Protein: Microtubule-associated protein tau
Amino acid sequence: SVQIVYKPVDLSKVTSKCGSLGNIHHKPGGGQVEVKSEKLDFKDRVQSKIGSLDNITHVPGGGNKKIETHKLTFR
Amino acid sequence: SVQIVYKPVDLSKVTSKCGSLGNIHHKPGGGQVEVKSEKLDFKDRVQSKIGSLDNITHVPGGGNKKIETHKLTFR
Amino acid sequence: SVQIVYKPVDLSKVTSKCGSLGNIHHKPGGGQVEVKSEKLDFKDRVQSKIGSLDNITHVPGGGNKKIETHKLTFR
Amino acid sequence: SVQIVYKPVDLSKVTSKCGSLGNIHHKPGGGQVEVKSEKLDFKDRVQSKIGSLDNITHVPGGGNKKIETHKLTFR
Amino acid sequence: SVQIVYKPVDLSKVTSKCGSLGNIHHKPGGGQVEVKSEKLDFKDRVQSKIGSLDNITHVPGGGNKKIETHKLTFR
Amino acid sequence: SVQIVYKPVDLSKVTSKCGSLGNIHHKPGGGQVEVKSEKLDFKDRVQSKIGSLDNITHVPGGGNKKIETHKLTFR
Amino acid sequence: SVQIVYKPVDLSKVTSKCGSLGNIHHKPGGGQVEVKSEKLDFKDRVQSKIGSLDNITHVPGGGNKKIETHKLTFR
Structure:
């Protein structure tokens, strides 16, 4: 016989108090990109950017992240 | 015989108090992109950007994320 | 017989008090990128950027992260 | 017979009090990148940047991180 | 008494033989311009551009110029 | 008495033989310009560009120039 | 009495034989310019660029120049 008991408890807390965020300026002068890739062959769970000129301004009032992977494997 | 008990408890908290967000400016001068890719062949769960000139201004009042993958596998 | 009891407790705390964020300026003069890659062949859980000219301004009021991987494997 | 009891307790605390953040300026003059890679072959859990000219301005009011990997393996 | 004789002779020649002109490509990625000029005051024979984002493709089969200012001033 | 004789002779020649001009490519990634000029005051024969992001592709089959200023001043 | 005789002779020659011009590529990654000039005051025969991000591709089949200033001044 086998018994497995997986009873994790999480009363955890992730938080911020953040006042004014204010004067965020993001002013990029524009570059230049070239790519040559005579053939491509992607096959499983692939994430790809091949050519890109990508600006982001990401200004979250909180932006608090909490990743909580569980895995229970029996064989 | 086998018994498995998977009883995780989560009373967890993810939070922000964020005041004014205010003057976010995102003013990108526009680049230039070229790609040559004489053939492509994508086959399973592929995410792809091949050529791109992509600006984002992402300004969430909260933006708090909480990812909670469970997996229980028996064989 | 076997008994396994996996009962972790987490009352943990991740936090910030952050006042004004204020004058963040991000003003990049635009570069130049070239790539030649006569063939590519990606096959499992691949993350790829092949050519890129990517600016980010990431200004989270909190931005507190908490990664909590569990794994219980029985054989 | 076997008994395993995995009962870690974590009442831990990760924190900051951070006043004004203020005048962060990030003004990069734009470089130049070239890559030649006549063929590529990626196969498992690969993270790759092949050519890149990437600026980041990451200004989190908190930015406190807490990584908590557990693993319990029985054979 | 005074005599002035202004008898310049010009049998001059300005010329080109120019075959095919062919594949001129002019593909500009679009910039960004800002100007602040709280007051302006222009007064004689002024040529001005104050803000501009101006592309030209000027492809004259000849384009030969010949400027020939004379001036004779007596007092 | 006075005599002045101004009899310049010009049988001069300016020339080119130029075959094919061919593959001229002009592909500028787009910059970024800012100007602050709280007041301006221009007054005689002024040529001015105050802010500008200006591309030119000037491909004359000849483009031969010949400037020939004369001036005769008597007092 | 006075006699002045100004009889310059110019049978001069300016020339080129130039075959194919061919593969001229001009691919600038885009910069960034800022100017602050709290007041300006221009007054005679002024040529000015105050802020600029200016690309030129000037590909003349000939481009031969010939400047020939004369001046005769009597007092």
